[PDB]
Amino acid sequence: MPLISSSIPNLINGVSQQPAALRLASQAEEVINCMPSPVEGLKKRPPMQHI
Amino acid sequence: MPLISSSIPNLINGVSQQPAALRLASQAEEVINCMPSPVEGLKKRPPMQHI
Amino acid sequence: LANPRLQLRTWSIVFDETSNFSMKITPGQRDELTYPFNGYKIGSGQFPIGTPSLATGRFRVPVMAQNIETKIVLFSDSPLPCRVQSAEWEGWYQERARRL
Amino acid sequence: LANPRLQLRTWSIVFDETSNFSMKITPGQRDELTYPFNGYKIGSGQFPIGTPSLATGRFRVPVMAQNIETKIVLFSDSPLPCRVQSAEWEGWYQERARRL
Amino acid sequence: MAFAQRIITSNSAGDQEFTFTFDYIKEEHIKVFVNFVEKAQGTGSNEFQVITNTTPKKISLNTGLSADNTRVEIRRVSSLSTPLVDFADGSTLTAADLDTAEKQSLFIDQELDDALKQGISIDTSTGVPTLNSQRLSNVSDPVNAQDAVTKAYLE
Amino acid sequence: MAFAQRIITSNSAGDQEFTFTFDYIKEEHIKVFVNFVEKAQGTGSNEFQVITNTTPKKISLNTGLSADNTRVEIRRVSSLSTPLVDFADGSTLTAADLDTAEKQSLFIDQELDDALKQGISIDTSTGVPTLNSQRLSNVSDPVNAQDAVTKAYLE
Amino acid sequence: MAFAQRIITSNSAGDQEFTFTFDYIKEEHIKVFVNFVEKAQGTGSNEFQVITNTTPKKISLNTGLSADNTRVEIRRVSSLSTPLVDFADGSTLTAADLDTAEKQSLFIDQELDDALKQGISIDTSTGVPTLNSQRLSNVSDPVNAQDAVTKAYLE
Amino acid sequence: AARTSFLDAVNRVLQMLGEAPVNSLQGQFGLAKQAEVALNDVSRTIQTEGWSFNTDLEKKLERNSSNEIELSSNVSRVVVDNLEYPDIDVVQRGDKLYDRKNNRYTFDEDLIVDMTTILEWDLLPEHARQYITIKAGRQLQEAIIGSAELTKLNLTQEVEARSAFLEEETTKSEHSMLRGHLNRTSPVNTYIPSRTLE
Amino acid sequence: AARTSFLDAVNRVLQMLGEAPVNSLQGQFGLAKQAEVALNDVSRTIQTEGWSFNTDLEKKLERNSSNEIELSSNVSRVVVDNLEYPDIDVVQRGDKLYDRKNNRYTFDEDLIVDMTTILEWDLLPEHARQYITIKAGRQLQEAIIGSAELTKLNLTQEVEARSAFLEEETTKSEHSMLRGHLNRTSPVNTYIPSRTLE
Amino acid sequence: AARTSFLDAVNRVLQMLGEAPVNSLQGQFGLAKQAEVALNDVSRTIQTEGWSFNTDLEKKLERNSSNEIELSSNVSRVVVDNLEYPDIDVVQRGDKLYDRKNNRYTFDEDLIVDMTTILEWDLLPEHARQYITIKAGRQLQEAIIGSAELTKLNLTQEVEARSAFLEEETTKSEHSMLRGHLNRTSPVNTYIPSRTLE
Amino acid sequence: TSLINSGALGVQTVITLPYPMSGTGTMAVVGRFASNNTIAHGQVIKATAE
Questions:
Q1: B40 interface with A at CB cutoff 8 Å
Q2: Is B22 on the interface with C (CB under 8 A)?
Q3: Which residue, E31, I83, F87, is CA-closest to J37?
Q4: A19, C83: Cβ pair inside 8 Å?
Q5: CB-based burial of residue F39 (10 Å sphere; 0-12 exposed, 13-18 middle, 19+ buried)?
Q6: Are F17 and F10 in contact (CB under 8 A)?
Q7: Does the N-terminal or the C-terminal CB of chain A have fewer CB atoms within 10 Å?
Q8: Do the two chains I and C touch, given a threshold of 8 Å on CB pairs and at least 3 pairs?
């Protein structure tokens, strides 16, 4: 009876509406106010300035 | 003489008339009122409305 | 493969957001059996009394026959939604010799 | 795979240059838990008193539930930066039979 | 007081209204008996109707009685030969059906207990069976005098 | 009509087949009595068997009656001490269980009502439950003033 | 066997405790009778209380028996007037409620059968009604040609 | 907390098999038939050996009009003492006794025997119910699933259950060696050597 | 719960093989016929040994007109007493006896032999039925599939069943070592050496 | 720190299985109900043996108006004294005693028996509570997941708990071999050969 | 819709469909709106006289 582990290599794949059994493990569920980029991974969204 | 198992990955390959020894095991035998789609799998067909 | 003896033991289904469906398993020249499932899990409080139930989980049943003498039918007649993702069986595999 | 019992035990996050974030884990029909983290490691002199903290390291927290009845949410509301690289989970694994 | 029956000796001839107190489920379960004669439910060619507009509820006949001091019986009886509510698969459970099933079972038990009491009881003054001072008949002649003696045999 | 009990008088010796019409739940819920001689269910040396391949369903004794006009009784008694359903947590509630529980309750109530009617039942024209052409007996010799007179006492 | 009652002829004045074996759902469903007088339930001024700690359970009277050979009856009655469980929408159903309903129905049926048997049953020896060595009482003066006769009317 | 019921036994058997519990037994839409037949068969197998709770002593048997002894439907074994009846040797055959020595199916007089009956589920005691349940679950799982780990666990549980049931039986029925054949009325005092030396 | 019947035994064998139960036995459309054949074969194999319940002692055999001894179709073995018959020893051959010392098929007088009979399924007692069922199930499963681990499991169950059957037989028949060959009528008291000392 | 309560035991069982702790007991929406069922079943299994804390000695039993002996819903075992009742030996069957010697369900007088009762979770003492908790947790984990090494670890824990429980019982109750059967009042001083030598 | 024997227990409602029936088939009624309704969501009702 093994206790064994893995990992999620990337977090830059976004939101999906498919049932959980047909998705990739990479695809997320809900993403709000994030800016997923391949340079820095997942980061908070940039701010908005006033003019 | 071991109790060992496999799985059926998808159920969206429809109906075939070939003998059972030459089909892809995915393929079904009789399909009625189903709407096989790649975004949610097998489901009951959409209803029909009146105008 | 066609020659080795393959005897089915259990048939399992994986669904998501389904309400009701039934299965009709008929062995060779024997009585037909049914195994309904309607989502209402007694004891669990996720679905109160008076609201439709849409569940998520696995359902398992025994077949107990030979692979070349089975009919498995997934039947549903309720007006509530029913969708399935995949299924997986399990049984005995016998080889009278070794494979070249 | 959908049938074998995969029970989650711990959840880990790897970050970099992150000041603050939080985790909100909710098992099946039980109380919600929180696990805030804010960079300031007591005893370490890399961040003196009076300057913002931007750390680099791993974080671990137990989930203690089943895979099909969990909500794991990464939450943050501070005005300080937060960026995350990857995550890794660890759980218990069972197969009631052998695999074809 | 009996749960679900009421025997009325008419005060005078010509009346058509009689009141009752017990509750019920469907009006088809109310039976009206007069002079050991069963009367149908409905309107017109029928003999009586049920009026539930007022309180307490009362039953009305379509014709007055011929003479006074006439025996009129009203007693409830639930459906014995068929369950009132059947459960169908693939629907949403409702508390109303469960409440209806419980009500039917309770009412049937009440009615049967009332029948037994109106039949043979046990007096709480001595503990021996009592008959509440009524008349017995249709008793076969005692082949052995173990049976109660009939006046035909006596006289 | 008799809901769940059929009593017959055997016409001739040697007869073995008898019929019945009431519904049932399990084949073990049917009891057959032959003048106080209870008979056990089963096949073989078991002295009676049930047959269900013909409408109406019929039972068959395993030995013909010695003498004619021997009373034979068929009665259905559902479980009274053990419930037919016992809900356990973690199961999938299906309408079949609820229907079976309803049917068991209805059959128990029907059997109790039929037993009460088989007993001494109300004489509607008079009121005391009439024995209905039966010899009430097994009453001991009079002890007090109002006690009835038996055969062994009056003789 | 009697299902849910026990009748005791006392044997010594001054006794307080009597044992009972049957099951129950709530303590307020137990009734105690002393020499044909129903006894209220409670403590202190109330004359009896239930001890559910020792096996077999027993009922204790707050006052000793005045005279020996005084009959005491312990009998269980479930609530025949209201259901013990009420279903409301939005409530997570649990097996406890369903088991409570089933137990209530079964216990009511058992008590009803016990009362029917304790009354005038049918003697299976000859298939005839029997009083089981009792005294028929409270029968009015008979008139018709087939009633029973009474000691008062004969004397 | 009453004794174990048939439905609880069926639920335990299914749980040990590894499935989900089933609400009831009548009109089930699951494995209730398989669980029921397994439990009944194991109960019969356990009962047909003869223990202290299902054996009658010095019971009299009566012949029919043709001098023939017919047993009931649920009589498992019949024993006749050899010393008492020196000219007759009987063995059970189907539902009739057979005079083995004289090669006859007829007798000359009624007999005094001790028989073993097979009891229904309701009338069994608690330890018998426990042992029957565990053995039935083991047998059903071994016949149906046939895996390895489940078989090992069921083996361990069955061994423990058998030990407990045997211990309970022996301490309930106090078998002895000095008394000899139990058919003799107890002449023994079993005066203990451990108490009265003071 | 009556004694095991033919349909129950067939269903048990099929279930041990691991295939769905059958409804009846007449006009079926499955392996029930093969299960019946295996049951009959194992029954013959077990009964041909000669046990307590299928052996007739002191039986007298009659000859036909041509001075020969004929045996029925279901006779398995016969034994003659060497001490009682010094000049004639017989050995079974087919359905007739052979006087192997005199090399003749003919005798001069009727014999008193011990006879063992193969019985039908109806007359078999309970323990024999159980042993037959388990053995037939194991043999049929081996003949149909051809496992090894299943054979190990069925061997374990068969060993347990054989132990139970032997214990039942030796408790029923009450064999002894003092009495010698049983053809002599019992003169033994087996007076208890343990009890009667007080 | 008070004695273990029902909620604490349920939470401990769930924690040993590997799930998050539950908050309360009534109106929950998890496995707590299955844990309760397992706890009750294991409690019954443990208590059916008969220990010091749940055994009544010298207890008198009363018959009903039909000359029958009726037991309660939670009576597990009864033992009568053979030396006190020589012509009657009884065995429990369901809820009514059966006089297997006379083959009757009816007796003639009240009996003096030793009775064992199944107790509720409230009345159980501490060591029994701990042992029941551990054993029920192990059994439920096996029934739900089905591991082997987890079963090994739980077996180690169960062995330790059983040893502790047995030691507690044998220290509390003070069993002895000199006294013989305890139904006789203690005449033994158990005078010590250890100290009083000076 | 129209109703029969109003004001009492056990009232029946007569529904008039916009189109003629095909009596061979079987028609049902399902509760629609997810709030403030007499019939609960998803409750099915089968006819007693068609």
A1: yes
A2: no
A3: F87
A4: yes
A5: middle
A6: no
A7: C
A8: yes
